[PDB]
Amino acid sequence: TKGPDAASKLPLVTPHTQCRLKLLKLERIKDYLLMEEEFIRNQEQMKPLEEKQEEERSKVDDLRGTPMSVGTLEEIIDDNHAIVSTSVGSEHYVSILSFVDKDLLEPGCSVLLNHKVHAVIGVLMDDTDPLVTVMKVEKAPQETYADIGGLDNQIQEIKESVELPLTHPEYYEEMGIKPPKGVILYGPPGTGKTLLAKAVANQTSATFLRVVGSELIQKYLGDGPKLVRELFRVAEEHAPSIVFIDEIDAIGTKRYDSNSGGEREIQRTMLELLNQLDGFDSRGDVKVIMATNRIETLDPALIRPGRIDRKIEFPLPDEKTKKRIFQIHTSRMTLADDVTLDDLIMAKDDLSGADIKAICTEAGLMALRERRMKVTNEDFKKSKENVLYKKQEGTPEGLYL
Amino acid sequence: VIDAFRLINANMMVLGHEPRQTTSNLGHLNKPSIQALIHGLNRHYYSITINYRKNELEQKMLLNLHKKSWMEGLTLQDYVVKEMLELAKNYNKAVEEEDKMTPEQLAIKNVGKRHLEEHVDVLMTSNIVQCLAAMLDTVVFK
Amino acid sequence: LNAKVRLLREELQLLQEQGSYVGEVVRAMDKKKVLVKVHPEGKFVVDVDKNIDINDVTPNCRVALRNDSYTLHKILPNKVDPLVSLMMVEKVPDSTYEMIGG
Amino acid sequence: DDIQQLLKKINELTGIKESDTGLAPPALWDLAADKQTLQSEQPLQVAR
Amino acid sequence: EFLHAQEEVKRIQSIPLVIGQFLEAVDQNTAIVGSTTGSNYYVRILSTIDRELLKPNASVALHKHSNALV
């Protein structure tokens, strides 16, 4: 078992402006962090009794040499001569006793031994592939939901799938319904799937797991799926948690034959991932979130109940969600009275949140170009033209219809 | 790389290892100190000071050996020496002429808050010896 | 002057000592210990010297590791095999700002 | 900015790691790890 | 004695060496070099060797015991 993320450094800065409250609020936070520094600065200073001038530890120091080799603990023998192999397959039946706890003996778990006499040292090392331990994150990026706006249905769905289960199972318990496990978020690019992922990551009581889809292309043949299997094992070990996979349309796509025979072998990774997700045995208590731009291209085998219990679409904000995003973004910046956000919202269609961020930033940049900190409607009039120029479509369907 | 070792029994380890009664020799013994692998296995051991036994007749015989045998001191054929000398001096003259640029720039530079090239002791010695060879050429013979 | 030169030549005797291996620190724990994986051979656990504090050690750093006692020697930067070749910050091109077109 | 500086320095100054494990409680090496262990440590060899 | 030291330093590099690839330079008189055996060592370089030639990967011979760049 384990715990999760430990960021959240007082998310109550609620004036959000140049006010003396936020001067008072943050200086309180400075006071408690300086004291907790001073609490650990003198914590060791008090009670000179430094482990009773030392005892017991000397034995473990002397018994085990300075360097400790590692190996795989093979068949155990009661006489402490369990077989162990080094990295080069140097299998050796060797004694194993010092001031060492002999209860965590299993085939296949890494064990530590002496460089010279190959005797088992003690600390059966408890660590995993660093390629995954790096993925673990305990720093919430930004605000949970306030920033996001307009996706009431989508946020409701994701909440029901993830947050509610690990808050109150009373309903689930009494009704006997197992909460949904897999969720796949899909939609046109920039709709904000990543935004919502970060959002939940900011308010997840459990440890978060982050992975990009194109991360299991290990060069060596085989290996690979072993990576994902170990990842799932680690995630299961560390208490309940959520595993997020971005751009999943890189390891599973229509599961088509080798064709040219290159044997890309990514198909093997996809099959192993699918097996781990749902096949035989039991997954345990682990939630899964998947994000992609194209979902149809995903092979059906990966996408089915028991693996992705929810498919959540993220459409382009039309007017109301569009207005929500627009004024949410503009809030943190000074704007003029004459500005008419609704005017721009109505004027333009097929506009995504990323474009809203870009257009507001560009309007601010243009205003700075004019040397005016305050913005004007004309600033937005120029910005929305500049930003929306790359898009050029429309067949000559201008007369027949 | 030779070295001398001697073991210590594990019965008297309560007593001092090597009772020392001389600072100079003890410090000289420690000057070699102990080798990495030596510490890796220094226990049950204590290196003992070694030294080359006094050597005069052997030393003198070897010294005579070097002059005539271990390096060119036949002293009768001891004296290209006029064939390749021209070419060696040509190389070194060209090289020194080239190297003379760097001191030029160094001097050119102002205060500002690779001139050292020597290359002259070699020429000095070589061509002074060649010129001295005239002594053999004109008197020692004929 | 030339006593100094002689002393420097004598101090060049340090070349006799064999160099230390190179190992990327897989993970550093407390109590002055770190598990490192040297390239030729599998990973192991080693004790750290006094020159460098533990906190300086982080996962995925290239520690120069003592050859004999398997004790930490130093830390080294630039754990980037061919991509530094693409870094090419050096060799600045011409100051073509003025001679750009209209 | 001083909040972030204090947070970084206190995260450095925590040092509550000490993942030092593997030893047995002093009730079994009581008559065990004492002499025979190190009395056989050099002699008791290893067979591949 | 100075001349003796100089000639000893020059001799230091004459002994048969082992080829290998220099990896990079840490600081003057020190560097990291990879051997033909594949292992990567942290060694020193003599003051005689000249830097610009050392900087590129290229190839270099090491002392079979000290492994120092020569």
Ligand SMILES: Nc1ncnc2c1ncn2[C@@H]1O[C@H](COP(=O)(O)OP(=O)(O)OP(=O)(O)O)[C@@H](O)[C@H]1O
């Ligand atoms: N409705 C919105 N409200 C607030 N911010 C939004 C909204 N829509 C988009 N954004 C912001 O604009 C960004 C652009 O979209 P994003 O980068 O999330 O792309 P995506 O395709 O949805 O996800 P990914 O980048 O993982 O493919 C969002 O991440 C978010 O920061």
